[PDB]
Design a protein around this ligand. Structure first.
Ligand SMILES: CCCCCCCCCCCCCCCCCC(=O)OC[C@H](COP(=O)([O-])OCC(O)COP(=O)([O-])OC[C@@H](COC(=O)CCCCCCCCCCCCCCCCC)OC(=O)CCCCCCCCCCCCCCCCC)OC(=O)CCCCCCCCCCCCCCCCC
Ligand SMILES: CCCCCCCCCCCCCCCCCC(=O)OC[C@H](COP(=O)([O-])OCC(O)COP(=O)([O-])OC[C@@H](COC(=O)CCCCCCCCCCCCCCCCC)OC(=O)CCCCCCCCCCCCCCCCC)OC(=O)CCCCCCCCCCCCCCCCC
Ligand SMILES: CCCCCCCCCCCCCCCCCC(=O)O[C@@H](COC(=O)CCCCCCCCCCCCCCC)COP(=O)(O)OCC[N+](C)(C)C
Ligand SMILES: CCCCCCCCCCCCCCCCCC(=O)O[C@@H](COC(=O)CCCCCCCCCCCCCCC)COP(=O)(O)OCC[N+](C)(C)C
Ligand SMILES: CCCCCCCCCCCCCCCCCC(=O)O[C@@H](COC(=O)CCCCCCCCCCCCCCC)COP(=O)(O)OCC[N+](C)(C)C
Ligand SMILES: CCCCCCCCCCCCCCCCCCCC(=O)O[C@H](COC(=O)CCCCCCCCCCCCCC)COP(=O)(O)OCCN
Ligand SMILES: CCCCCCCCCCCCCCCCCCCC(=O)O[C@H](COC(=O)CCCCCCCCCCCCCC)COP(=O)(O)OCCN
Ligand SMILES: CCCCCCCCCCCCCCCCCCCC(=O)O[C@H](COC(=O)CCCCCCCCCCCCCC)COP(=O)(O)OCCN
Ligand SMILES: CCCCCCCCCCCCCCCCCCCC(=O)O[C@H](COC(=O)CCCCCCCCCCCCCC)COP(=O)(O)OCCN
Ligand SMILES: CCCCCCCCCCCC(=O)SCCNC(=O)CCNC(=O)[C@H](O)C(C)(C)COP(=O)(O)O
Lengths: 58, 438, 127, 120, 536, 83, 15, 77
C-alpha cells in the first residue's frame, strides 16, 4: 500500500558527510605520556629509582 | 498624549514631503521631537490618577489610547532608542521602512483596544519581511520564520479578541470583563508565547536579529520584545487571570525550561549577534514568570527588568554592529586582540557585558533583585532555580570576553567619532538607571 | 625583559576543522590550550582520574577518622570532662534561644531535652 | 612513550631517555646540590647496560625505563620563564609592524554612513 | 570623615583610569600613594573612634536605592567594630601595595590602569566591609569579584591568565548566587536587610547551608579552592591584595557578621581545608603557589575556630587581621625575589647578597606564619588551637596542619636564603627604591603594632588547659620546622604526586563536569533547536 | 639580544673543556664531537651544559641535530634569547 | 569560491 | 584576498616544531555516561528541593497520624 510514509523525506541518513581528514592543533611534545592508572605500583619502589634518587648521598 | 500621538503620525508624514536629500536630517529632528513629546506626555501624567494617567478617544473604541505604568515606560524607551536607529540607517527606502515600523510599534503600546492593538502591531509584518530579506545582507529564511511565527500567533490572538468582542460586546481594556474560558486564554497567551521568545517558539528571533541591519536589531531587541509585556499587563492579566493561576505549574515549567535551554544553546554560539540574541531569550523568561505571578512585586519587577534589557541589549547590538563595520566579521575566532587594538570599544563592550550579567551598579541588578523577590514571594524553590542557573550566562560571557580580549592582531579596529556619539546616550542612561533613577 | 619578549605564532589552520574545534583556545601564540585544562590531551603529572580516585579512597578514611568518633561515637555527657559555661538565669535563658549556641548541650540543666530538640531544628521554613 | 619517541631510532631513543631522565632529576630535586649525585647515578645506570647486545634484553630495558620515566613525570616542570610554558612567555608580546590604521574614520563619507535596504 | 576613605580610593581609580593620559605614569605614582595615605589617616581616625572608644556611626547616603512595593533598601554605611578593624587593615595593606607597585609595574605598559584597578578594588572592599545592609555587602562582593577578574587576567595574551580569570568569575558567580538566595530568605522572614533587624535566634538549616556555600567561594574552602591556586597568573601586587585581605577574608567576614553558621559543618570543612591546603603546599615548587596554599590553610583555621566556642568569631577576625599583614609581606617579598632572579622556581633560588630589609621582612613574615612564640601570628594561632581542644576531631586535624605548615614554611625559608645559589651565571638585577623600603617599613610597623595591641579582647584570657596541652602547638611547629630544614621525605612518591595534582579536583571537573556541561549544550542546541526543529 | 659569534665560541669552548677525556687542545671552533672523543651520553650532557651556560631551552629535535662544535655555535648565535 | 551544500548522489544518476 | 596558509618557521628552532599534534578526537561524552552524570549532578544541584520534599512529607505524615489518633480518641469517648 502506497502511503505518505513512503514519500516523506525521513531523516535516516546524513545529507552531508563530514570530511574524513581533520585538523589536529599543534601541541608541545611530551616525550613520555602513558597515564598512571594504579595508585600503588612496583614502579615507585623500583630498584632503578632507589639507586638513582633515594640512595645517592646528598 | 495628544501631542505624542500627533508627533507619531507626523513622522511618517514628513517623509512624503522631504527633498529626498534632507531625509536623514528631517528624520532625526522628527525623532527628537517625538522624544520631547514623550517627555511632555510624562510631564502631563499625574500620579494622582492611579489607574490610567491619561485616556484619549477620537470617536470610536478602536481609537481609544491611554498610558499606564507599563505603557509609559515602554513608550519612553521607544522614543529614547529610536534616534540611534535613525542615525545608523542610510537611504530613503530604509528610512521609510524604519519610520513606518516605529510608528506602528509606538501606536501599539498606547492602544487600549485589542483589535486596534492587533491592527497596529501586525501592520509592520511585510516591512520586516522586506527588511530582514534585503538583497545582499539579508536571509529569506529568517524573514519567512519571523513572518510566519508572527502571523500564526497574532491570528490566534485575533480569534480570541473576536470572541471577547462577541461575548462581552466590547474588547476595550477600560471596560472590566472577566473570562474563565481556557480556549480564549490560550489564544491570547500564544501571541505572548511567540512574541516574547519562549522555548520552543524562540527560533524566529535569532535568525531575524542576525540578518537584520543594526538599526533593525537594535529596535527589535530594545522594544519589539517588550510589546509582549504590554499585552500581558493590558490585555491578558485583567481578563485571563484565572487561567494563569490554573496553569501556573505549566507556565513555570515552560519559562524555566526556556531559561535553561536558551542558556545552554548560547554556549554553542560562535557569532556575536547570535550570542546577544540568545542572551535576550534567556532574559525574557524571568520577566514573563514575574508578571505571571500577578503580584505588585512581579509586575513592577518585570517592567523594570524590561527597561534594563531595553537599555543593555541595544548597547551590545550597537557595539557588535560597529565592530562588524570595522572588520566585516562576527566570528569570535577571527576577532582577537580587541583589548589592545580597540581600548575605547573594549571599555564600552566590557561595561555593557557587565551590565548584561546583572552587576550591582547596573539597572539589571536592581531589576533582577525585584524579580527574584517576587519569585521568592511565590515559592523559595522558584527563586532558587533561577538564581542557580544564572552561572551559565557567566560561562558563555566569560569565554567570549576571554577569546576577544587577547591574542595577536595586525589591524587597528577602533570606534570613530560617530560611533562614540551613538552609544553615549545609552551609556549615560545605563549609568543613571544603575544608580537608582529607574 | 618583561615587555617585548619573542613569541612563536600558531600556524594558520590548513586542514578541515573538527566540528568541536570550539573546545580549543588559540589566541595566535603557538601553545594553544583546551578550554578546561585536563579535559583532553596531556594530563599534568601523567595522572588519570582513576589514579586520583584511588588516592582519595586511600586518604578519605584516615582524614574522616577523627571526626566520626566525636560526632557519632561520643555523646554530650562523655565528649568533655566539664559542663558548658554556667550563666545567670536571665542570661542563660536568652542564650539557650540561639540554635547555634553552645549552652544547649548542658545535660545538667533540667531543660536539656527541649534544648536538644531546639538544636536539631527545622530543615526548611514551615511557612 | 609517545609516538614521536617510538618512531625514533635506537640511538636517538636512548639519548632522549637520558635527556628526559636528567630533566626529571632536576624537577624532583630541591637544589642544585642534589642534582650532581643523582645525575652521576643516572649516568652510571645507563653506562652499566650500554655494552649489552642481546636485542630482547635491550628492548626490555628500554621499555621499563620508558615506563619509569612516564610514571615519574613531574606535575611542575622546571622551565625557564621566557620559554613556552613559562610565566613571562607572552606577557607583552612584541608587536609586529605593518598595522592597518584607518585615519579620520568618521570623516569618510560622513553623511552617507549607514546601512541600506536594496530591493528589486 | 568616615566617607573620605572611600572617596579617596574611588577618586584615585577614576583619575588613573580615565585621566591617565594627562596624569602620566609619574602622576599615578603620586596620586595613588597620596590618596592611599589620606585614606590611611581617615581609617586610623575611624579605628580610634569606633574600636578603641566604642562609637559606632551610621551614614545614610540616600534612601530608596531599591523601592519596589514592600521591598525597600537604602545606601547606608555603619562603622561597627568589625568594620573599623577591617577598614584599617585593608587600607594599610592597600597603601603598602600602592607604594610597592610604583617600582614593580614600571616595566608594564598600563601602570595607570593597574593603579586604577587597585584603587577601585580597595574601594569595593571598603564598601563590602562598611555596608549596613545586605545589598551594600552584595555591591562590594560583586565589585571585588569584577576587579579580581580584571586584575588576574591583566596579561591578555596569555591563555592561562584569561582562563584563570574566567575560573575566578564562574566560582564567584556560584557563590554569590547562594548568597543571593540566603539574602532573599532572610529578607522574607525578618522583614529587612539591615543587620540590626536581621538577627534570628533559630534559622532553618537551608539558610545556614546557603550562607556557608556563599562564603566558601570567596574564602576558598574545599571544593571551591580551585581558583586561588590559578590566580597566580596575575601580577604580584594583585596576589598580595586578594590573598591577604580583599577576597579570602570576605567569606569569614560574612560568616562573623551574621552568625547563621552551623557548628558541625564549619568545623569539619575548615579542618579539612587546613590539612588539604598544607598538603598541597608541601608538593608545590612555585614560590607564589606555596604562599597561596598557606593562605588556604590559614583560612581553614579561621573557619574551623567558629565551631569551637562563642568567642570563635572574635578569634577568627583576630587571626584574619594578623594574617593580612604577614601574608601581604610574604607575597611582596616573593615578588621582589622573582623580579630580582627572573625565576619562579624554588630549586633555582639560593643565598645571594641583597637588601637587609627584604630578607628580614621575609624572615619575620615566615616566623609569624610558622608560629614563633611572642609574635602576632603566634598569639592569633594559639588562641585558635588552644580553644579547639574541646572538639577532638578539629583539634587533631589542625595540629597536623600546623606540622605541615611548619614543614613547608621552613623548607621555603631554607631554599630561598640558606641554600646555595641555584640560578645561572647571568646578569640579573632589580634595584629597590626608597618607596619599596617605605612599603616594607609599613608592613613591619603593622607586624610590630599587632604584638603590642593584640587581635582579640579574649586573646590572653586563660584557657583552662594542662600545661602539656597548652604548649603542644609550639612543639609541633618546632618539629615541623626542624624536619623542613633537613629537607626530609615525608610521603611516598604516589602521595607526593597526588598532592602535586591538588587532589585532582580540577581533573574531575574537566573530565566529568565540563563534559556534562557541554553535552547538555550539545543536546540543547545541535540535537534540538538546530537539528530536530530546523528546516532542511 | 643577538650575541656575537666570538663570545659564543669562547663560551662553548669553555664548556667543552670540562669533559675529562677531551684534550684541551683538540677542541676547535669547527670540530665534531666524535673527534673530541664524546659518546652519545656525553653529547646529551654537553647539550645540557650549553643549556645552563646560555640560559635557554633547546627543543629535543634540534638538540638531536647538535653533534659538532660548529653547529652548536651556529644554533646559539641564531637564537635571539641566548644570554 | 564559497562553501556550498553537499548534494547527495551522482550527477548523472540524479538526472 | 584570503590570509596566507603558509606558517612562520622563524622561531621553530627557538621554541620547537609544530609537527606534534593533539591526540584528541574532538568528540563528546558517550550517551550512556551522560545519562548517569546528568541524573547524578542535577539532583545534587537541586538539594533544596529534596530538603523541602523531606520536611513536607514528614509534616504531612505526622499530621495524618495525629488526625488518626484524634479520631480514635474521639470515637470511644
Ligand atoms: C491637508 C493639508 C496637507 C497636509 C498633509 C496631510 C495629508 C495626510 C496624508 C497625506 C500623505 C501622503 C500619503 C502617501 C501616499 C503614498 C505613500 C507611499 O507610496 O508609500 C511609499 C512612499 C515612498 O515613495 P518612493 O520612495 O518615492 O517610491 C515608491 C514608488 O512609488 C514605488 O517604489 P517601489 O516599487 O520600489 O516599492 C518599494 C516598497 C517595498 O515593497 C513593499 O514593502 C510593499 C509593502 C506593501 C505595503 C506595506 C505594508 C505595511 C505598511 C504599513 C502602513 C505604514 C504605516 C504604519 C502605521 C500603521 C497603520 C495601521 O517600499 C516602499 O514603497 C516604502 C516602504 C514603506 C512604505 C509603505 C507605506 C505605504 C502604505 C500605503 C501607501 C499609500 C498608497 C495609497 C495609494 C493612493 C492612490 C494610488 O511614501 C513614503 O514616504 C513612505 C510611506 C508614508 C506612509 C504614509 C501613508 C499613509 C499610509 C498609512 C495607512 C493609514 C491609513 C491612511 C490614512 C493616512 C492619513 C489620512
Ligand atoms: C520531549 C521529548 C523529546 C523530544 C523529541 C524526542 C522524539 C520525538 C519523536 C517524534 C519525532 O520523531 O518527530 C519527527 C517527525 C519529523 O520527521 P523527520 O524524521 O524529522 O523528517 C521528516 C521531514 O521531511 C523533515 O524535513 P525538514 O527538515 O525539512 O523539516 C524539519 C521540521 C520537522 O519538524 C516536525 O515536523 C515536527 C516539529 C514539532 C513536533 C511536535 C511535537 C513532536 C514531539 C513532541 C512530543 C515528543 C514525545 C515523544 O522541523 C521544523 O522546522 C518545524 C519546527 C518549527 C516549529 C517549532 C514548534 C515546536 C513544537 C514542539 C517542539 C517539539 C518538542 C521538543 C521541545 C519541547 C518544548 C515543549 O515529526 C513529526 O512527525 C511530528 C510528530 C508529532 C506531531 C504532532 C501531532 C500531529 C497532529 C496531526 C493530527 C492529525 C490530524 C488529522 C487530520 C489530517 C488532515 C489535515
Ligand atoms: C567617562 C567617565 C569619566 C568621568 C567619570 C565620572 C565620575 C563619576 C563619579 C562617581 C559618582 C559616585 C557617587 C555615588 C553616589 C551617587 C550620587 C547620587 O545618587 O546622588 C544622591 C545623593 O547622594 C549622594 O550624594 C551620595 C554621596 C556621594 C559621595 C559620598 C561618598 C563618595 C564615595 C563613593 C561611595 C558611594 C557608595 C554608594 C554605593 C551605592 C541623590 O540624592 P537623592 O535625592 O536621595 O536621590 C534619590 C535616590 N535614588 C538615586 C535612588 C533615586
Ligand atoms: C560604587 C561607587 C563608585 C563607583 C566607582 C567604581 C570604580 C570606577 C568605575 C569606572 C567605570 C566602571 C566600568 C568601567 C568600564 C569597564 C571597562 C574596564 O573597567 O576596563 C577596561 C579598560 O579600562 C578603562 O579604560 C576604564 C577603567 C577606568 C576605571 C576602572 C576601575 C575598575 C572598574 C570598577 C569595576 C566596575 C564595577 C562594576 C560591578 C560592581 C578594560 O580593561 P581590560 O579588559 O583589563 O584590558 C585593558 C588592557 N590590558 C590588557 C593591558 C589590561
Ligand atoms: C561538583 C561541583 C561542586 C562545586 C562547584 C563549583 C565549581 C564547579 C566547576 C568549576 C568550573 C570553573 C572553572 C573555570 O571556569 O575555569 C576554566 C574555564 O572552563 C570553562 O569555561 C568550561 C566550562 C566549565 C564551567 C562549568 C562546567 C562545570 C559545570 C558543573 C556541573 C555541570 C552541569 C550541572 C548543572 C548545570 C579554565 O580552566 P583552567 O585550565 O583550569 O584555568 C586555570 C588556569 N590555568 C591555565 C593556569 C590552569
Ligand atoms: C542636570 C542634568 C542631569 C543629566 C543626567 C541626569 C538624567 C536624569 C537624572 C534624574 C532623573 C531621573 C528620571 C529617570 C527615570 C526615573 C523615573 C521614575 O523613577 O519615576 C517614575 C515615573 O513614572 C514613569 O512612568 C516615568 C517614565 C519615564 C522614565 C524613563 C523611562 C525610560 C526612558 C529611557 C531610560 C533613560 C532614563 C534616564 C515613578 O517611579 P515609581 O512610581 O516606581 O517610585 C519611585 C521609586 N522607585
Ligand atoms: C483540524 C486541523 C488538524 C491538524 C492538521 C494540521 C495540518 C498542517 C498544519 C500546519 C500548519 C502550520 C503552517 C506552517 C507550515 C510550516 C511552514 C512551511 C514550511 C516551508 O517550507 O516554508 C518555507 C519557509 O518557511 C519557514 O521558514 C517557516 C519555518 C516553520 C514555521 C514554524 C511554524 C510556526 C509555529 C508553529 C506552531 C506555533 C503555535 C501553534 C499554535 C517556505 O517555503 P517556499 O516559499 O519555498 O515554498 C515552496 C514549496 N515548498
Ligand atoms: C500538555 C501541556 C500543555 C501545554 C501548554 C503549557 C502552558 C500553556 C498554559 C497557557 C495559559 C492559559 C491557557 C489555558 C489552557 C491552555 C493549556 C492548559 C492545559 C490544558 O490543555 O488543559 C486542558 C483544558 O484546556 C483547554 O481546553 C484549552 C487548551 C488549549 C486549546 C489549544 C488550541 C486553542 C486555540 C484556540 C484559538 C482561540 C480560540 C478562542 C475561541 C485540559 O485539561 P482538563 O481541565 O480537561 O483536565 C483533564 C486532565 N485529566
Ligand atoms: C575531605 C572531603 C572529601 C573531599 C573529596 C572527596 C572525594 C572522594 C570521592 C572519590 C572516592 C570514591 C571514588 C569512586 C570510586 C571509583 C574508584 C575508581 C574510579 C574509576 O575507576 O573511574 C573513575 C571515575 O571517576 C570518579 O571516581 C569520580 C567519582 C567522584 C564522585 C564525586 C565526588 C567529587 C570528587 C571531587 C574530588 C575528587 C577527585 C578525584 C575523584 C575515572 O573515570 P574515567 O574518566 O577514567 O572513565 C573513563 C572515561 N570514559
Ligand atoms: C626521577 C627518576 C629518574 C628516572 C630514571 C629512569 C631512567 C631509566 C634508566 C634505565 C634506562 C636504560 O638503562 S637504557 C640502556 C639500554 N641499553 C642499550 O641500548 C644497549 C645498547 N647500547 C647502545 O646502543 C649504545 O651504546 C647507546 C647506549 C645508545 C649509546 O651510544 P654511544 O656508544 O654512541 O654512546
Amino acid at each position: 500500500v502506497k502511503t505518505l510514509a513512503d514519500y516523506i523525506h525521513w531523516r535516516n541518513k546524513p545529507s552531508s558527510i563530514p570530511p574524513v581528514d581533520e585538523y589536529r592543533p599543534p601541541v608541545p611534545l611530551v616525550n613520555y605520556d602513558k597515564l598512571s592508572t594504579q595508585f600503588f605500583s612496583k614502579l615507585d619502589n623500583d630498584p632503578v629509582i632507589n639507586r638513582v634518587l633515594r640512595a645517592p648521598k646528598v | 498624549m495628544s501631542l505624542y500621538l500627533f508627533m507619531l503620525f507626523l513622522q511618517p508624514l514628513s517623509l512624503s514631503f522631504v527633498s529626498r536629500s534632507f531625509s536623514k536630517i528631517s528624520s532625526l529632528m522628527m525623532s527628537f521631537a517625538t522624544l520631547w513629546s514623550a517627555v511632555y506626555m510624562w510631564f502631563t501624567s499625574n500620579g494622582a490618577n492611579q489607574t490610567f494617567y491619561q485616556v484619549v478617544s477620537w470617536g470610536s473604541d478602536w481609537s481609544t489610547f491611554g498610558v499606564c505604568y507599563t505603557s509609559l515606560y515602554i513608550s519612553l524607551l521607544c522614543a529614547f532608542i529610536f534616534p540611534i536607529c535613525v542615525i545608523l540607517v542610510q537611504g530613503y527606502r530604509a528610512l521609510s521602512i524604519l519610520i513606518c515600523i516605529q510608528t506602528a510599534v509606538s501606536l501599539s503600546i498606547v492602544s487600549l483596544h485589542m483589535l486596534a492593538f492587533y491592527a497596529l502591531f501586525e501592520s509592520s509584518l511585510l516591512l520586516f519581511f522586506i527588511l530582514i530579506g534585503r538583497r545582499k545582507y539579508g536571509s529569506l529564511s529568517a524573514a519567512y520564520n519571523i513572518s510566519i511565527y508572527t502571523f500564526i500567533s497574532a491570528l490566534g490572538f485575533l480569534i480570541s479578541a473576536f470572541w471577547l468582542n462577541w461575548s462581552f460586546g466590547s474588547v476595550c481594556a477600560l471596560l472590566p470583563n472577566e473570562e474563565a474560558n481556557s480556549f480564549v486564554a490560550f489564544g491570547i497567551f500564544i501571541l505572548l508565547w511567540v512574541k516574547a521568545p519562549l522555548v520552543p517558539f524562540h527560533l524566529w528571533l535569532p535568525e531575524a536579529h542576525v540578518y537584520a541591519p543594526t538599526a533593525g536589531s537594535v529596535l527589535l531587541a530594545g522594544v519589539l520584545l517588550k510589546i509582549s509585556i504590554v499585552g500581558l499587563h493590558v490585555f491578558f492579566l485583567p481578563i485571563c487571570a484565572s487561567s494563569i493561576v490554573k496553569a501556573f505549574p505549566l507556565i513555570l515549567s515552560i519559562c524555566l525550561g526556556s531559561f535553561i535551554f536558551s542558556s545552554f544553546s548560547t554556549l554553542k554560539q560562535i557569532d556575536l549577534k547570535k550570542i546577544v540574541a540568545y542572551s535576550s531569550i534567556s532574559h525574557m523568561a524571568i520577566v514573563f514568570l514575574s508578571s505571571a505571578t500577578n503580584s505588585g512585586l512581579g509586575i513592577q519587577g518585570a517592567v523594570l527588568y524590561c527597561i534594563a534589557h531595553g537599555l543593555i541589549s541595544p548597547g551590545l547590538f550597537l557595539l557588535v554592529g560597529i565592530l562588524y563595520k570595522n572588520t566585516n566579521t562576527k566570528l569570535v575566532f577571527y576577532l582577537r586582540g580587541l583589548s589592545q587594538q580597540a581600548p575605547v570599544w573594549w571599555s564600552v563592550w566590557v561595561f555593557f557585558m557587565l551590565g548584561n550579567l546583572a552587576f550591582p551598579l547596573f539597572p539589571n541588578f536592581i531589576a533582577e533583585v525585584v524579580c527574584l523577590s517576587a519569585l521568592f514571594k511565590n515559592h523559595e524553590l522558584y527563586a532558587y532555580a533561577f538564581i542557580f542557573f544564572s552561572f551559565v550566562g557567566t560561562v558563555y560571557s566569560s569565554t567570549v570576553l576571554g577569546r576577544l580580549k587577547g591574542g595577536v592582531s595586525s589591524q587597528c579596529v577602533d570606534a570613530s567619532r560617530l560611533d562614540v556619539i551613538s552609544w553615549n546616550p545609552l551609556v549615560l542612561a545605563t549609568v543613571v538607571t544603575g544608580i537608582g533613577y529607574m | 625583559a618583561g615587555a617585548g619578549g619573542p613569541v612563536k605564532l600558531s600556524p594558520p589552520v590548513d586542514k578541515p576543522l573538527p566540528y568541536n574545534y570550539d573546545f580549543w583556545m588559540d589566541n595566535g601564540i603557538y601553545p594553544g590550550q583546551p578550554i578546561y585544562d585536563g579535559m583532553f590531551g596531556s594530563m599534568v603529572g601523567n595522572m588519570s582520574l582513576e589514579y586520583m580516585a584511588k588516592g582519595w579512597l586511600v586518604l578519605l578514611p584516615i582524614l574522616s577518622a577523627p571526626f566520626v568518633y566525636e560526632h557519632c561515637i561520643a555523646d554530650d555527657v562523655t565528649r568533655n570532662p566539664f559542663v558548658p559555661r554556667q550563666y545567670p538565669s536571665e542570661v542563660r535563658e536568652f542564650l539557650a534561644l540561639f540554635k547555634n549556641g553552645f549552652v544547649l548541650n548542658d545535660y545538667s540543666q533540667p531543660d536539656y531535652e527541649e534544648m536538644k530538640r531546639r538544636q536539631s531544628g527545622l530543615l526548611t521554613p514551615i511557612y | 612513550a609517545s609516538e614521536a619517541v617510538l618512531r625514533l631510532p635506537h640511538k636517538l631513543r636512548v639519548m632522549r631517555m637520558y635527556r628526559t631522565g636528567l630533566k626529571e632529576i632536576v624537577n624532583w630535586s630541591y637544589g642544585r646540590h642534589e642534582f650532581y649525585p643523582r645525575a652521576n647515578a643516572l649516568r652510571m645506570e645507563f653506562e652499566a647496560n650500554k655494552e649489552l647486545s642481546d636485542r630482547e634484553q635491550i628492548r626490555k630495558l628500554v621499555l621499563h625505563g620508558e615506563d619509569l620515566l612516564a610514571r615519574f613525570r613531574h606535575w611542575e616542570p622546571t622551565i625557564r620563564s621566557e620559554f613556552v610554558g613559562g610565566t613571562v612567555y607572552g606577557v607583552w608580546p612584541q608587536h609586529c609592524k605593518d598595522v592597518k590604521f584607518v585615519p579620520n574614520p568618521a570623516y569618510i563619507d560622513e553623511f552617507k554612513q549607514g546601512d541600506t535596504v536594496l530591493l528589486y | 570623615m568616615f566617607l573620605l576613605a572611600v572617596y579617596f580610593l574611588f577618586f584615585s581609580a577614576i583619575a588613573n583610569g580615565f585621566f591617565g593620559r594627562y596624569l602620566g605614569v609619574r602622576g599615578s605614582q603620586l596620586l595613588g600613594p597620596s590618596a592611599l595615605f589620606l585614606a590611611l589617616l581617615c581609617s586610623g581616625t575611624i579605628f580610634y573612634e569606633v574600636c578603641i572608644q566604642g562609637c559606632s556611626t551610621n551614614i545614610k547616603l540616600f534612601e530608596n536605592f531599591v523601592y519596589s512595593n514592600e521591598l525597600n533598601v537604602s545606601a547606608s554605611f555603619l562603622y561597627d567594630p568589625l568594620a573599623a578593624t577591617m577598614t584599617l587593615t585593608v587600607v594599610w595593606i592597600s597603601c603598602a601595595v600602592h607604594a610597592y607597585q610604583n617600582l614593580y609595574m614600571r616595566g608594564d605598559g598600563s601602570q595607570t590602569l593597574f593603579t586604577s584597578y587597585l584603587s577601585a578594588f580597595t574601594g569595593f572592599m571598603l564598601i563590602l566591609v562598611a555596608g549596613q545592609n545586605l545589598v551594600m555587602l552584595f555591591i562590594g562582593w560583586e565589585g571585588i569579584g569584577v576587579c579580581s577578574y580584571l586584575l588576574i587576567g591583566y596579561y591578555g595574551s596569555r591563555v592561562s591568565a584569561v582562563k584563570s580569570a574566567n575560573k575566578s568569575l564562574i566560582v564567584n558567580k556560584i557563590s554569590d548566587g547562594f548568597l543571593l538566595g540566603s539574602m532573599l530568605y532572610l529578607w522574607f522572614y525578618t522583614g529587612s536587610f539591615s543587620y540590626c533587624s536581621l538577627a534570628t535566634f533559630q534559622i532553618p538549616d537551608v539558610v545556614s547551608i546557603l550562607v556557608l556555600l556563599g562564603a566558601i567561594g570567596k574564602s576558598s574552602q574545599l571544593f571551591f579552592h580551585v581558583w586561588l591556586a590559578d590566580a597566580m597568573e596575575g601580577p604580584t601586587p594583585v596576589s598580595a591584595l586578594i590573598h591577604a585581605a580583599t577576597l579570602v577574608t570576605a567569606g569569614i567576614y560574612v560568616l562573623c557578621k551574621l552568625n547563621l553558621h552551623s557548628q558541625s559543618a564549619v568545623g569539619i570543612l575548615g579542618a579539612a581545608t587546613a590539612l588539604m591546603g598544607g598538603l598541597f603546599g608541601l608538593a608545590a615548587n612555585d614560590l607564589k603557589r606555596v604562599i597561596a596554599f598557606s593562605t588556604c590553610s590559614q583560612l581553614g583555621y579561621m573557619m574551623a575556630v567558629l565551631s569551637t566556642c562563642d568567642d570563635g568569631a572574635d578569634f577568627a577576625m583576630g587571626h584574619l587581621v594578623s594574617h593580612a599583614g604577614f601574608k601581604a609581606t610574604l607575597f611582596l617579598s616573593a615578588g621582589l625575589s622573582i623580579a630580582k632572579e627572573n625565576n619562579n622556581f624554588l630549586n633555582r633560588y639560593g643565598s645571594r647578597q641583597g637588601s637587609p630589609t627584604l630578607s628580614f621582612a621575609t624572615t619575620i613574615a615566615s616566623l609569624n606564619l610558622l608560629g614563633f612564640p611572642e609574635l602576632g601570628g603566634f598569639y592569633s594561632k594559639e588562641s585558635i588551637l588552644n580553644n579547639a581542644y574541646i572538639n577532638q576531631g578539629v583539634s587533631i586535624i589542625l595540629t597536623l596542619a600546623t606540622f605541615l605548615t611548619a614543614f613547608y614554611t621552613s623548607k621555603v625559608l631554607a631554599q630561598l636564603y640558606l641554600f646555595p645559589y641555584g640560578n645561572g651565571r647571568q646578569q640579573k638585577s632589580f634595584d629597590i627604591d626608597a618607596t619599596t623600603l617605605i612599603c616594607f617599613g609599613l608592613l613591619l610597623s603593622e607586624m610590630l603594632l599587632r604584638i603590642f595591641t593584640g587581635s582579640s579582647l579574649s586573646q590572653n584570657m586563660t584557657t583552662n588547659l594542662p600545661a602539656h596541652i597548652k604548649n603542644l602547638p609550639f612543639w609541633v611547629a618546632l618539629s615541623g620546622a626542624l624536619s623542613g630544614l633537613a629537607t626530609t621525605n615525608l610521603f611516598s612518591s604516589n602521595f607526593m604526586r597526588f598532592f602535586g595534582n591538588r587532589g585532582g579536583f580540577d581533573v574531575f571537573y574537566a573530565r566529568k563536569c565540563s563534559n556534562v556541561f557541554y553535552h547538555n549544550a550539545y543536546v540543547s542546541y545541535t540535537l534540538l533547536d538546530r537539528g530536530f526543529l530546523k528546516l532542511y | 639580544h643577538g650575541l656575537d659569534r666570538d663570545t659564543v665560541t669562547e663560551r662553548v669552548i669553555h664548556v667543552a673543556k670540562h669533559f675529562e677525556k677531551v684534550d684541551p687542545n683538540k677542541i676547535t671552533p669547527t670540530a665534531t664531537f666524535e673527534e673530541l672523543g664524546l659518546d652519545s651520553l656525553d653529547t646529551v650532557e654537553l647539550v645540557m651544559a650549553l643549556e645552563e651556560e646560555f640560559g635557554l631551552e633547546i627543543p629535543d629535535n634540534e638538540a638531536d641535530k647538535i653533534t659538532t662544535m660548529a653547529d652548536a655555535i651556529s644554533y646559539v648565535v641564531s637564537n635571539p634569547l641566548a644570554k | 569560491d564559497e562553501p556550498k551544500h553537499q548534494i547527495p548522489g551522482n550527477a548523472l544518476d540524479n538526472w | 584576498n584570503y590570509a596566507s596558509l603558509k606558517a612562520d618557521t622563524s622561531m621553530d628552532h627557538v621554541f620547537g616544531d609544530s609537527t606534534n599534534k593533539l591526540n584528541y578526537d574532538f568528540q563528546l561524552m558517550s550517551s550512556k555516561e551522560a545519562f548517569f552524570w546528568n541524573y547524578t549532578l542535577y539532583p545534587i544541584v537541586g538539594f533544596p528541593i529534596f530538603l523541602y520534599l523531606y520536611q513536607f512529607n514528614k509534616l504531612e505524615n505526622f499530621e495524618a497520624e495525629i488526625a488518626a489518633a484524634k479520631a480514635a480518641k474521639a470515637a470511644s469517648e
